[PDB]
Amino acid sequence: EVGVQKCKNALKLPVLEVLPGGGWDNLRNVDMGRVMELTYSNCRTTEDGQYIIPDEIFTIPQKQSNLEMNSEILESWANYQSSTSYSINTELSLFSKVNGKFSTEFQRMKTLQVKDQAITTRVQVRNLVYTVKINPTLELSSGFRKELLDISDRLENNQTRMATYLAELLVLNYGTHVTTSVDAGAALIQEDHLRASFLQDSQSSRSAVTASAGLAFQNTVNFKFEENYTSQNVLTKSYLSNRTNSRVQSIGGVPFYPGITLQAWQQGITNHLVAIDRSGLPLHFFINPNMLPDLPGPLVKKVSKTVETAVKRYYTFNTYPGCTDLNSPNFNFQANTDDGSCEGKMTNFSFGGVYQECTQLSGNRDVLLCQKLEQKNPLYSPVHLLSQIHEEGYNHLECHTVCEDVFQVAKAEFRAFWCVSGLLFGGLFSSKSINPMTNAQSCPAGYFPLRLFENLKVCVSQDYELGSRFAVPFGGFFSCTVGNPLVDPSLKKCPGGFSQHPALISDGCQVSYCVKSGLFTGGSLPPARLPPFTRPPLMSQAATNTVIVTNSENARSWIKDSQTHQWRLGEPIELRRAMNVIH
Amino acid sequence: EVGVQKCKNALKLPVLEVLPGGGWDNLRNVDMGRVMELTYSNCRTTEDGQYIIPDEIFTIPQKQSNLEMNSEILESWANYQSSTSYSINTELSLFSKVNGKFSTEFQRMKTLQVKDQAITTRVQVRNLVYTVKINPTLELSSGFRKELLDISDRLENNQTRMATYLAELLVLNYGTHVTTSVDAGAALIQEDHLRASFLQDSQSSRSAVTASAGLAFQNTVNFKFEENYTSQNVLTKSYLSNRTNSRVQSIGGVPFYPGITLQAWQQGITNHLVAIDRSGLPLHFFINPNMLPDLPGPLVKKVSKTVETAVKRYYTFNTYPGCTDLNSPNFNFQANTDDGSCEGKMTNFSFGGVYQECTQLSGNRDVLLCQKLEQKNPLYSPVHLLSQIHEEGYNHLECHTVCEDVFQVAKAEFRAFWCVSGLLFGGLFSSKSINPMTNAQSCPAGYFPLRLFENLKVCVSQDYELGSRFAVPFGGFFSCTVGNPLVDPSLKKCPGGFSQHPALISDGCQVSYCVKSGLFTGGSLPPARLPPFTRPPLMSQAATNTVIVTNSENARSWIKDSQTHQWRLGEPIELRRAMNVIH
Amino acid sequence: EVGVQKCKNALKLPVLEVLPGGGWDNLRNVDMGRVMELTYSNCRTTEDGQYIIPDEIFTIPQKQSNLEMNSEILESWANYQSSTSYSINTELSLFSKVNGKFSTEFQRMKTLQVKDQAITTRVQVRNLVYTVKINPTLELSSGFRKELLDISDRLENNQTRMATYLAELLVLNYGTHVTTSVDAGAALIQEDHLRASFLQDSQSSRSAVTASAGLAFQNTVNFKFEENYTSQNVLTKSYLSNRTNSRVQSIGGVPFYPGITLQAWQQGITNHLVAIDRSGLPLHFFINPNMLPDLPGPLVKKVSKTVETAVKRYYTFNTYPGCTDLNSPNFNFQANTDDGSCEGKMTNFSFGGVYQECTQLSGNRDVLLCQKLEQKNPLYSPVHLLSQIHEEGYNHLECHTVCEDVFQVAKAEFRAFWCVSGLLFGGLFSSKSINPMTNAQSCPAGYFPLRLFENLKVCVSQDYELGSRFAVPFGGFFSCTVGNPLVDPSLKKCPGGFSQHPALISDGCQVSYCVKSGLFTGGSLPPARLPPFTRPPLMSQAATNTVIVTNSENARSWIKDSQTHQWRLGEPIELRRAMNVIH
Numbered sequence A, B, C: 001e002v003g004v005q006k007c008k009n010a011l012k013l014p015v016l017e018v019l020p021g022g023g024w025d026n027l028r029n030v031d032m033g034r035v036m037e038l039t040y041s042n043c044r045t046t047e048d049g050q051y052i053i054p055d056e057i058f059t060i061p062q063k064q065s066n067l068e069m070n071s072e073i074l075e076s077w078a079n080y081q082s083s084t085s086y087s088i089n090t091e092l093s094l095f096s097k098v099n100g101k102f103s104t105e106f107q108r109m110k111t112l113q114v115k116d117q118a119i120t121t122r123v124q125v126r127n128l129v130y131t132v133k134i135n136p137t138l139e140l141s142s143g144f145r146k147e148l149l150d151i152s153d154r155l156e157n158n159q160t161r162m163a164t165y166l167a168e169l170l171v172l173n174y175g176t177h178v179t180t181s182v183d184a185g186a187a188l189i190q191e192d193h194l195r196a197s198f199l200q201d202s203q204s205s206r207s208a209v210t211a212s213a214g215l216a217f218q219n220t221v222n223f224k225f226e227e228n229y230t231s232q233n234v235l236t237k238s239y240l241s242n243r244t245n246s247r248v249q250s251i252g253g254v255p256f257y258p259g260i261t262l263q264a265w266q267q268g269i270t271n272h273l274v275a276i277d278r279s280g281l282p283l284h285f286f287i288n289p290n291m292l293p294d295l296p297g298p299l300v301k302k303v304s305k306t307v308e309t310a311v312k313r314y315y316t317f318n319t320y321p322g323c324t325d326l327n328s329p330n331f332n333f334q335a336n337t338d339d340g341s342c343e344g345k346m347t348n349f350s351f352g353g354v355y356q357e358c359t360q361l362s363g364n365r366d367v368l369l370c371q372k373l374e375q376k377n378p379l380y381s382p383v384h385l386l387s388q389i390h391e392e393g394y395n396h397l398e399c400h401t402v403c404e405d406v407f408q409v410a411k412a413e414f415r416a417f418w419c420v421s422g423l424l425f426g427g428l429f430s431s432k433s434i435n436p437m438t439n440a441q442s443c444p445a446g447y448f449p450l451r452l453f454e455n456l457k458v459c460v461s462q463d464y465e466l467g468s469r470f471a472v473p474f475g476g477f478f479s480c481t482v483g484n485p486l487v488d489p490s491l492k493k494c495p496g497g498f499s500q501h502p503a504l505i506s507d508g509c510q511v512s513y514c515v516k517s518g519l520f521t522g523g524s525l526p527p528a529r530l531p532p533f534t535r536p537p538l539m540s541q542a543a544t545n546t547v548i549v550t551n552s553e554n555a556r557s558w559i560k561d562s563q564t565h566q567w568r569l570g571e572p573i574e575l576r577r578a579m580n581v582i583h
């Protein structure tokens, strides 16, 4: 009787199913959450008189219908068009070469080009109908507003590392962007994968290749699967023979089956409309004093700085520099960002060994952390590489039968070294990784592991006749703070010929290691690594109540009242009586 | 008149049958339980106006329809795609090489490749319709909330080994994950199994193999079973002759029969939608102070640590290291995880014998446990391998005719040894296993059993002329704490050439034994070993009442009131009056 | 107006006919009883809107449809797949090699392979629809709860041997398992039995055998019985000639007749759904203090130990060790469990004779049991083999015409011996068996019987010229406590070349005897031996009232009130006043 169903009973019209305002992940092109609030109170319609739209939504009739007769050749996977999220992946940002490179449509296309030495062609029937946009005066959703107040409460009780944790659960549930405009329509695409040596002789008749690819697309749709085709004349005999893959997907409308008139596909697009393009803005753009009137001024500029840090950390991880030229050697298959590390010679290095010590600062009673946090050399110059503090909580139970239990914490800082007539290297495996020497979390035969950063193992053998089959050279560790001195004989990268691999993200700082195997390189493409990148804190910090919030340079002060009402602006006679009881 | 039927009478629409929130087992890809609460109070619909969804559920219209013209070749069973649970099996975890390897679809495919020396190809018509997700603000179910309170009660009455037992009945009923997003659709798959020598000559024309496999798939669906096929031209005469198996399964929609137009299959998918992909999060992720507001803070971080231990124990069991290379010798067929134990030479070892002693600490009256817990040598250096305590309860009946009965317990610790001109080895069989020398729970001819770990038998014969037909060599025992010293002449694995086998899980610690038979290896694939891995306790521990719960480092205290009301936060004037009567 | 018919009048929908919660016998794959309570109060439906389900039941839509084009060859009957109860027969148990080996489908398949030297192939169209499961919070049925209280009453009046008898009537009525999940669907199977020498020459073209077997299956279903087949080309001329049997069974849906389109069979599966797979848990798993809140704690752990003993006794009986290799001699046809007793030489033994004595302890008046309980030698070293006490009740009638009758009992312990120039052996026959020398309960010509264990006869003749046609050698008696000393010249088995046979189960202990005939071996397969394995007791034990039940180690006590109300927990001030009047 309220909301949609009140409008839907009076009008008896469908609701438009393609709406802006939701969140958007831009590494994996998926949408998530609902940032903006959508209400159906005025019973608005599209001025066709055909759909029902919310109140803060205006549509623009496009009624456009493209129809292409030539496929387009896109040879490299580095410059990637998306066909559904092209306007939002190509924004001007620092990470424009990482957007969209963890999606379903991209990971298939990179696989089919590398494993077959192939080039791809697509041809398309696109058919845009509306453009749906949001008004500039707009209200946040009920569930998204409550999660911004919780980050503000943790920042005003001096609880960092809990506000940081709640900011990374905001990226996980709402993405990195907000879509401000969509495009309702229905596409129909065919992608083929031709052998790359079929293009190189037909450099003059490249226009004859793509003319037959768009010719075969309209035989596939118009003719039923039995061969009544009109394309097999001259070069639709090697086009069929140099191709390595073919698929046809429809995105809106009715489902596609071979042999359906393009007349009949285009008459089922009504009431089956999806978003075939979209654009938007980053997520921290919508955190400003205009959208949040209840909080003070400089407090929402501190929440918006926390969310901006969590989004940029999510792009800093899931970024793999390496070599990208396919015909060159040292080709890294997991790399999504070029480095210039191609055509670079190598030089062998000898590492003496790794060792690890612990400190055991506070928790001397009832918990002994400083036995597994220590690792000594099985057999140069060591480097420190990390200063990491490990905290653990335990439980007493004082009984008196009534009892009580108290929770302490136990700190133990550890230090992990490596030496710059030497131990061999057999790979690494962690609690989120495997060793690709064995395709399993095990060192090979003869090798023995030893812990280095409290979560991963270091496959090492001291021999020179039996473990020489799995021995791969080593290039050096570095971190987010200290680069290795092996490059520039500093910078944070591998030397030439080597490739880096992530290992052991530890509280907003990952360390890396350089190898030269060729076996760590290949395999399947890695998935995206989702936030939170930190385990939850133990609530060890005490809450410090803040009552008055001020800034010095325009003489504005916000006084929180009793009862936790709200933040009102401080009149200059009440803050005069509130600072004496404070100071 | 409430719930679904109120919405279903007014709207007269079906309910969407593919919903998130339920549990999920990730070794065997099955779903179980319902972790999240789903309510039908606002009578929401999918904005098509076609289905009825719960209140805390938002759908995303995809309306996508893939159609592939080439089969894909996947040669090895080690890297396994699932086609229905691929997004959730490939999560970043320690046990990513064990997920999905106890399911129906996997165990068939490993069988058909090993027993035939075959490779598999699949081709598919996939047709995704919606994406159904859960809101981040969400309530636990009524039945799952009550089983988390019962683990908290056992932890606050100092009843360990009962809270551990109730945590393993939570994994049995709700799985190891919670699905947070599903994909409603309907697939149609054909899998074939070609002979592996048919690929190796057609290395150049591998693209001609897969083009005919996708050609035969569309003759099978479009043509009725009588041969009107258009594929038998050149190489659809050995493709039919090198194949070893073939099946066609449909997953959603109407049932498949040979000869049905793809037009007609795709028009029955409405109202018959199933989950063709899903993703989720682990089960202990959803146990936090946000979801459980009634319990104290550090108490739900102790329940969530108990459930995390029970899940990781379920992956530690059902893990079989061994050799995996098929053409190599020493191939272990039961192994699902590689070891590097391939291409390793063997060395014979002589074991003197096993013997077992008992202690009989407490139950000296009315129960004699220390006669069957003892086993002496029928005929080096012994090792201890285990220190296990065996508890049994009995019953007095004091009569006075009125009577009364009291229940005691009887402890008897046992020790089981083995010696590092020697007894022969004929296999083992237990209360959950058989001896594969006989395919039965019996020692062979000439062999006599003797107990070793209070539940299994050790087939042994002292002769050298008659029991030499069933004698297999022996490689050594080890446990979850002590590895054998026979490897590295320590580590917890077999020496080279040998294979390990589980025997006698005893209270969260299994022991293993290394053999070299070739007969223990083969057979059928083992099923998953389900929790609980411990028999129920005898309630021997006394309940210790806890009233006040505190942590030291933010000065928060929770005071349980009378009547067992609930846990309220302790004001600093009531805990001042509650600690004096306590201490 | 209540229950099903209230929901069935409002909704006008059928009820789903495949439900969990019932019992299950696992030797004979049949279902029996109803352990869990099923109520129809909320009028729930399957979210199709198609069936009506109970309240504590959730279904999972599968909508899957397999279709196989190759038969599968299963050569041996030892590893047996069931096609309807495969998930529940393959549980991890001690008796996994006995599950399902007394069913209708197994006993036919073992018969057709032994009597014809044949191998079996099956091909199948499987079509799974739903998966129906039970919630973890669940209530026992009304009739099953009342039979668990009756076992508890006999255990608390010190009436053993009546609680043991009532526990074996619980296995008879409710089976050994409870099904927790079923699979609604409809299969369609063809089984053939080919001659075993037809496989051995087609080792390379085994893939051509199974391709024609799945080809003949789809000619049988699609074509009417007149020969319009498309299979008779090359090897569908000896496949028809090497086969020894053929049947086609349907399990759900409409009945099968030759010539029906697979289109038409798959459209009758709606409203005709049966269980095509199931899984479950043992019966004593569901006897715990959670399911039975009224009884005390350690009392339901004593009922659950009694039922576990009665189930394991039912698997200990119906287990026949013997030789299993078919081409080897000494092949035992009744044996369902291997022994290693194949390829073993024999040695003749001479037994002097059997004799039997009685004691007549108590019933000296009015009943003379010690004349038929005695048997003396008709003509070494004797062994005792059994100490069994025989009790009989009689009736006085004291008259005074008014009268009264009193019932006593008469005990008479008997002892049965056999001697380790000798009596010949002609077989045995009992009150539940026959002599297979005559296929009747009679000794052969010249032989005379003599009683040994108060119920069976021992066919014996002292001659050496006339009873030499029916004389078979003898291998020795043993029991559940004492093995024979003839093996290991101890163990409880036959010597080599001999086979054991059951005789005279007497109060939870059977004795066995070893022969070497070849005529006792063959015949028909024995049926399952159902509980109770003990005649009912004579109520000779006096009832001892128990009022207070306690355990020592958590200081909990349960005080039964007056009137036989119930068992309430004892407060520490009432048991203080209840133990003084007790002790």
Ligand SMILES: *[C@@H]1O[C@H](CO)[C@@H](O[C@@H]2O[C@H](CO)[C@@H](O)[C@H](O)[C@H]2NC(C)=O)[C@H](O)[C@H]1NC(C)=O
Pocket: A158, A160, A544
């Ligand atoms: C507010 O929080 C910050 C962040 O932890 C505190 O700063 C640290 O406090 C510890 C405790 O003495 C010091 O050892 C560190 O050196 C401090 N670090 C920095 C960068 O200042 C701060 O003390 C807290 N303030 C209050 C009043 O609790």
Ligand SMILES: *[C@@H]1O[C@H](CO)[C@@H](O[C@@H]2O[C@H](CO)[C@@H](O)[C@H](O)[C@H]2NC(C)=O)[C@H](O)[C@H]1NC(C)=O
Pocket: A195, A197, A198, A201, A238, A241, A242
């Ligand atoms: C892949 O493409 C090449 C073209 O670069 C094909 O090679 C030509 O095939 C035609 C077919 O008759 C010949 O007449 C030409 O002589 C070939 N060479 C050149 C340089 O044009 C090749 O055949 C294609 N692959 C397949 C499998 O057909």
Ligand SMILES: *[C@@H]1O[C@H](CO)[C@@H](O[C@@H]2O[C@H](CO)[C@@H](O)[C@H](O)[C@H]2NC(C)=O)[C@H](O)[C@H]1NC(C)=O
Pocket: A399, B158, B160, B544
């Ligand atoms: C709480 O439970 C723990 C777990 O059993 C008890 O700890 C053990 O108690 C026994 C009894 O004296 C000792 O023999 C063990 O050495 C203890 N083990 C450990 C690791 O502490 C503990 O005593 C219980 N506390 C109370 C008050 O009952």
Ligand SMILES: *[C@@H]1O[C@H](CO)[C@@H](O[C@@H]2O[C@H](CO)[C@@H](O)[C@H](O)[C@H]2NC(C)=O)[C@H](O)[C@H]1NC(C)=O
Pocket: B195, B197, B198, B201, B238, B241, B242
């Ligand atoms: C399995 O595949 C092999 C190909 O590796 C087939 O062998 C070829 O069969 C064709 C059939 O006429 C012959 O012309 C070739 O000479 C064979 N050899 C090669 C190297 O191509 C084999 O026939 C297939 N199996 C069956 C049963 O047909």
Ligand SMILES: *[C@@H]1O[C@H](CO)[C@@H](O[C@@H]2O[C@H](CO)[C@@H](O)[C@H](O)[C@H]2NC(C)=O)[C@H](O)[C@H]1NC(C)=O
Pocket: B399, C158, C160, C544
């Ligand atoms: C409770 O029942 C048991 C089981 O029969 C009784 O135990 C036997 O009692 C007879 C009668 O004196 C003795 O001859 C046996 O030696 C007893 N056997 C055992 C194993 O104890 C027991 O006496 C009964 N108790 C009462 C109070 O009636």
Ligand SMILES: *[C@@H]1O[C@H](CO)[C@@H](O[C@@H]2O[C@H](CO)[C@@H](O)[C@H](O)[C@H]2NC(C)=O)[C@H](O)[C@H]1NC(C)=O
Pocket: C195, C197, C198, C201, C238, C241, C242
């Ligand atoms: C049972 O199978 C055997 C195959 O092992 C058949 O023997 C063959 O029959 C064909 C029929 O013409 C002959 O051409 C072959 O020479 C036979 N022998 C071999 C070794 O292949 C046998 O005929 C089958 N039984 C029946 C009754 O047909």
